[PDB]
Design a protein around this ligand. Structure first.
Ligand SMILES: [Cl-]
Ligand SMILES: [Cl-]
Ligand SMILES: [Kr]
Ligand SMILES: [Kr]
Ligand SMILES: [Kr]
Length: 162
């Protein structure tokens, strides 16, 4: 298992525009298109990302290319973030995959706001952090996924994904 496989499980794969758990237009492997209520705005954004007139539909290869770019940007965002980088660098490989999933889902800004869990993860206080992470709107809104990611930070293994 790796970050790619991990997020493909968490996000699924859809080739037609769809709404995500917050009702926003997305496509692919969780590639958010826009926060706008306008389906045309979403279609415009999709055509721009793909570089062709998609008419709301893409291929698996195109979904995978956007997925690659999104994982990349997520990592890069972490590395450039003064609040994130030091934490991520102190983590082992498994846990880092957990941090990327979070940033992938809620953004850099969003994750940078978990000040307390962040410090606990830097200190290797696994159980404590898992309890703090769960006290969040993130967990109450998407509890099955939050639990998987939380277990991954807690244990440092992929058990939650097998
Ligand atoms: Cl894009
Ligand atoms: Cl969920
Ligand atoms: Kr992090
Ligand atoms: Kr994190
Ligand atoms: Kr976090």
């Amino acid at each position: 298992m790796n970050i790619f496989e991990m997020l493909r499980i968490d996000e699924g794969l859809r080739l037609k525009i769809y709404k995500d758990t917050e009702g926003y237009y997305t496509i692919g492997i969780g590639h958010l298109l826009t926060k706008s209520p306008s389906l045309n705005a979403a279609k415009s954004e999709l055509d721009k990302a793909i570089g062709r007139n998609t008419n709301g539909v893409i291929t698996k290869d195109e979904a995978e290319k956007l997925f690659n770019q999104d994982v990349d940007a997520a990592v890069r965002g972490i590395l450039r973030n003064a609040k994130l980088k030091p934490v991520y660098d102190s983590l082992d490989a498994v846990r880092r995959a957990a941090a990327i999933n979070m940033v992938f889902q809620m953004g850099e800004t969003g994750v940078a706001g978990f000040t307390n869990s962040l410090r606990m993860l830097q200190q290797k206080r696994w159980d404590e952090a898992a309890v703090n992470l769960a006290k969040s709107r993130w967990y109450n809104q998407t509890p099955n996924r939050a639990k998987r990611v939380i277990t991954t930070f807690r244990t440092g293994t992929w058990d939650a994904y097998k």
